[PDB]
């Protein structure tokens, strides 16, 4: 119960660098609630995990801007590397 | 004296005028495909005593002026290069930021007239009015609600709540519609 | 072209939907024609032989035919600007004849070969004008000039990362015969930060009917309420 | 006593019109019905909300047509479900239905099958829904190199294009050869990705075609004559070919090819035809195994190189996949229901094929022990065998053999199947059997549906009507009632077959009553009926001129195109030389109907183990207010 | 299933004032004009969203 309260506190302070160790230990206990006087320990552990899967953040932001900057004036190739098109092969040719 | 085949241009067909075989005195007028404009004034080819007339016409696809992301909004569609000529067919989508709801057309594509199919929408703050619950009366006294604000209501005599008994203000509107069922 | 064309049709109606018609074949032919068999490509300055095969498909009528190879400054043959390359052959009925021409491609790129023919005593002529690719003597090669890791937030200064790419070796490069360097950008995704959800089966026992008095009722209501709240968030009603 | 029941497809699709049939059996007066579809489990939005009234004039049977918008609310990823809530008066009947992400169909047509570096690929994407009707949506297109890396994305619109989307992609001069791919998917359904390939290669047209055609479509392992092969070479314009052919044979084992150098032959091609025989002795000597039985299961491939006497063109062609077999046929029970009704005639759809997989025409088949039950395969290689089942709970085991005369018993094909008894509600022995004469059905005819009832006579008068439903392309096409008089065991339903039944439809009919221990009982039965694959309308391209007039290079010609009024027709003319080089990924009508049938929600030829299995296996969810309902379906894909 | 407005008859009307929707088991009575004779049951009842049979008025001479 105490560790569940603390996890709910880390989910409010946005300290996502300390959350993975806590959650992993909670899963290792295999405590599934229920039983004689499980009320608090059942409510809090599942409330904290439900809040952990809610505040769950998707993927590390990918947004690369790669510009070929050549001293001679011509046409300029700009590139927006986004998450949705990360695998897109962006080829740029230069004859010299 | 026959001329040769006047050749095909990309994205364009031709019809013969004044005859039916590529012979002396025929005209081969060209017309581009749907979404492609007849670039230039050279639109025909006449089989003369030496050959066809000047040039072979060129078809080019019409393009749309790029659109920027609206105030408090983003453009989450199309592809690759930003602020490049969007040509006939390419579609685009708008998605407002968290806390802003779309007010207009959500999508649009590059039309034939070099313009966009629909107009550029706006991103307006999420706002929910006080719902008029049928066979019931509200509990809360607030009229204007921001996002995620809850709206408490009760059902009149002879009625009771259906599923959810309150309403939450989200971007698309109230998520739980205030409804009252028979007892 | 002297071949058979396959015309394919697909119709789309508002009330009838999609329909792919059966292929309609249309064969195109002539009584007399030239089949100019050109290779896909040839090496610059290398002597090659091409064949122009003249076909006469008349049942019982022989043809006295004259065949000519047009002069082209981009190729080398006996055909010059002053003299022509003619030969007067006789093609028997229902038969064919092969005329060999020896040429030497002089300049690279899409060059053109044109062979014409006309028969004596008849209003029957044909011409064939085809193109072939002339390719530099050397062999297509590519060198991996650079492979650099892009990471501005980690390897870059003030948020920008500048990579300097050295010029390619190009030591055995054929004079001129230009090169093309490809700069290939791709993204490196991550997506990992989520803890394994509690198995849905291990929660089957938390659905309990509440009973008892003011305090025991809540003891029975807690596991059921909290179970639905968890299964709703993790979306595990499929396995449950 | 009154029972409210709803039926909805096993899986519900987005942006597609779905029907729901509502019944209130043993009811009087008007019954107000309001159907609402909500998301699962939160019910944040009301996806649909329609109303109807069940009046005695309509026999208390109505339908609700609704189209669920592809809302931005649905999240690989977890599977999504919806809650279907039907309200009849006070009573409410709810069912949780699975949702498929497929928005409809996308078909890609490239002008050619193979392309040279530098040329432009012209392709059209046809955008339709599950009814194959043109729609206007946003489609994402990905160009993919043989390595697998996408090299060009795009997002276009199908609106105001009549369901046809003309696109092009330029091939660079410097490019990697091999099999390229186009990948398109609807914007709303990024999980349903349709693909087409095209080869990129440096080539020249061969100007003629070489055909390697074996005498038989297989090779009998004990045939001393060996594999005799006829070579047929002809120019692309029709005329025959004189030349010389180099023919060589090989044995293929899975993906390991072993050439037989001793079998190499040089034969004259005279009058466009030649013959070369692979002797059995050379075949056995070529392989390092004296036991010929081991060659069974392997295949043979033939490679022929024809050179013209002029020496100006050369064509290599190959014919592989010639199975070395011990039987000319192969029996499959993939079209015969695996459940029977004890005491009622059991129908079997035997599927006899040639070793190469093609249907086999006029093949005698019979059941072991029942020489009387001997049928003949039709044009599609499907035969019908009706047997008489005894009233029993014993597993019905059937063994079908081919009885092709003039063929020895060692070469006759054999296959064994088993069917299980249709378990009834409370062992009441109440069965329903729908039978249909198995024959190629065509649009514009009428099929007599025979409703045959078997049950005790103690409750036979209560059954006054049957409820029949039709499933086509994965959606409810038609529902209705069939009046039945007390005493009649068999009634005939004149079902009018129109173009909306292509390519096939399932007919699942059921009746309900209150019998035995005053329990509400439902008995169902379903049958799968195939229809002659064809277009919904028609489209023919023929000569629009005199066939004395011969086509000449450059000559104008008239093309007669006859099709449906208002239809937009897209054309393409391809040189047959292309197909001599590559004839794969060609858009045909048979392939379109193939895709449609693979997205079907039904998983069985017919019937089921119980009354719920009939609905579930036929792609339907039944849910009554009394509690009789089908089990949930959580699998987008059918069970293996 | 509630009922709707009661059906009108010839040479007669309802004794009360009509409502838009009637709860189940509701009932309204009928009445003919003067010198007309009512035949049948003067009361109709809302059953299964449908009123029962309305009476008829007999024409005098
Ligand atoms: C869901 O439930 C509805 C209930 O209406 C069903 O709709 C029935 O579907 C029939 C398809 O077989 C249709 O019958 C057709 O009606 C044609 C007339 O067109 C109507 O035009 C009006 C415009 O005022 C529209 O509202 C209607 O929807 C129709 O489009 C007829 O020419 C034709 O035939 C008729 O029916 C019988 C056939 O034997 C004749 O005897 C009769 O005299 C009449 O000519 C054609 O069959 C029609 O839409 C409708 N019919 C009836 C009787 O309700 C849906 O099919 C149901 N959907 C599912 C999936 O079950
Ligand atoms: C250059 O591109 C080619 C594309 O085909 C790469 O592929 C190999 O190509 C060579 C011939 O150029 C052959 O050995 C094989 O077809 C391929 N080899 C392998 C191991 O895949 C080639 O690797 C590229 N070279 C460089 C230096 O990037
Ligand atoms: Ca079929």
Curated annotation (Swiss-Prot), chain A:
This is Complement C3. The record marks 73-74, 90-91 as: Cleavage. The modification Phosphoserine is found at residue 91. Plasma. Precursor of non-enzymatic components of the classical, alternative, lectin and GZMK complement pathways, which consist in a cascade of proteins that leads to phagocytosis and breakdown of pathogens and signaling that strengthens the adaptive immune system. It comes from the Eukaryota. In absence of complement activation, the C3 precursor is first processed by the removal of 4 Arg residues, forming two chains, beta and alpha, linked by a disulfide bond. It is linked to Complement component 3 deficiency: A rare defect of the complement classical pathway. Patients develop recurrent, severe, pyogenic infections because of ineffective opsonization of pathogens. Some patients may also develop autoimmune disorders, such as arthralgia and vasculitic rashes, lupus-like syndrome and membranoproliferative glomerulonephritis. It comes from Homo sapiens. Changing residue 54 to A: Impaired binding of C3d to CR2. The gene is C3. It is found in: Secreted.
UniProtKB/Swiss-Prot annotation, chain B:
Residues 1-61, 62-125, 126-182 form the Sushi domain. Expressed in the retinal pigment epithelium (at protein level). CFH is one of the most abundant complement components in blood where the liver is the major source of CFH protein in vivo. in addition, CFH is secreted by additional cell types including monocytes, fibroblasts, or endothelial cells. It is found in: Secreted. Sulfated on tyrosine residues. Glycans are attached at residue 135. Disulfide bonds join 3-47, 32-59, 64-110, 96-123, 128-169, 155-180. Homodimer. Also forms homooligomers. Interacts with complement protein C3b; this interaction inhibits complement activation. Interacts with complement protein C3d. Interacts with CR3/ITGAM; this interaction mediates adhesion of neutrophils to pathogens leading to pathogen clearance. Interacts with complement factor I. (Microbial infection) Interacts with West nile virus non-structural protein 1 (NS1); this interaction leads to the degradation of C3. Sushi 1-3 domain represents the minimal unit capable of cofactor activity. The property to discriminate self surfaces from non-self surfaces depends on the C-terminal region made of Sushis 19-20. This is Complement factor H. The lineage of its organism: Eukaryota, Metazoa, Chordata, Craniata, Vertebrata. The gene is CFH.
UniProtKB/Swiss-Prot annotation, chain C:
Residues 157-176 are annotated as: Disordered. The modification Phosphoserine is found at residue 171. It is found in: Secreted. Plasma. C3 precursor is first processed by the removal of 4 Arg residues, forming two chains, beta and alpha, linked by a disulfide bond. During activation of the complement systems, the alpha chain is cleaved into C3a and C3b by the C3 convertase: C3b stays linked to the beta chain, while C3a is released in the plasma. The alpha chain is cleaved by the serine protease complement C2b component of the C3 convertase to generate C3a and C3b following activation by the classical, lectin and GZMK complement systems. Phosphorylated by FAM20C in the extracellular medium. Glycans are attached at residue 142. There is a cross-link at residues 213-216 (Isoglutamyl cysteine thioester (Cys-Gln)). The record marks 157-158 as: Cleavage. Precursor of non-enzymatic components of the classical, alternative, lectin and GZMK complement pathways, which consist in a cascade of proteins that leads to phagocytosis and breakdown of pathogens and signaling that strengthens the adaptive immune system. In absence of complement activation, the C3 precursor is first processed by the removal of 4 Arg residues, forming two chains, beta and alpha, linked by a disulfide bond. This is Complement C3. The gene is C3.
Curated annotation (Swiss-Prot), chain D:
It comes from the Eukaryota. The modification Phosphoserine is found at residues 16, 48, 273, 279. Glycans are attached at residue 63. Disulfide bonds join 603-638. Changing residue 568 to W: In AHUS5; leads to impaired binding to the regulator CD46/MCP and resistance to cleavage by factor I. The record marks 517-518 as: (Microbial infection) Cleavage. This is Complement C3 beta chain. The chain holds residues 23 to 664 of 1663 of the full protein.
